[PDB]
């Protein structure tokens, strides 16, 4: 008899930061680095998506023109010492708020803030990104 090994087919949508659709950020952090900044339960986290202009010295968008709270999708399987979070804005259901704002002004950037579930904790920022995470 012919052999059919177990094959998982990965399907889905990887990261997108483009006009006309939700931001999809498939982000991987280091567990050792999260644990160090006080992240004990990697499950207990909230994300804010910040749209605006970053501060020239710190890189933080302190006065976002738009913010959005996102409950991530968390893949069950992770590379050793890594932690994936899939952070996707609610554009499809909210009037395309994130994309319309982000791309209403070519100076604007999108920055992703990780905190604990209730907003506390050390604030862990992504780079303030341009289109296509540049």
From Swiss-Prot:
Query: Any transmembrane segments, and where?
Result: none
Subcellular localization is given as: Cell outer membrane
Instruction: Name the job this protein performs.
Output: Involved in TCP pilus biogenesis. May be a channel protein.
This one is known as Toxin coregulated pilus biosynthesis protein F
Please give the organism.
Vibrio cholerae serotype O1 (strain ATCC 39315 / El Tor Inaba N16961)
The encoding gene: tcpF
């Amino acid at each position: 008899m012919e052999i059919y090994p177990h094959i998982k087919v990965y399907e889905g949508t990887l990261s997108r930061l483009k006009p006309g659709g939700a931001m999809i950020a498939v982000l991987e952090y280091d567990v050792n680095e999260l644990s160090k900044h006080g992240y004990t339960n990697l499950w207990d986290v909230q994300f804010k998506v910040l749209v605006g202009v970053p501060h020239a010295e710190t890189g933080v968008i302190y006065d976002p023109v738009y913010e959005e709270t996102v409950k991530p999708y968390q893949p069950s399987n992770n590379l050793t010492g890594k932690k994936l979070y899939n952070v996707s804005t609610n554009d499809m259901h909210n009037g395309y708020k994130w994309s319309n704002t982000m791309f209403s002004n070519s100076n604007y950037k999108t920055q992703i803030l990780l905190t604990k579930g209730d907003g506390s904790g050390v604030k862990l920022y992504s780079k303030a990104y341009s289109e296509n995470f540049k």
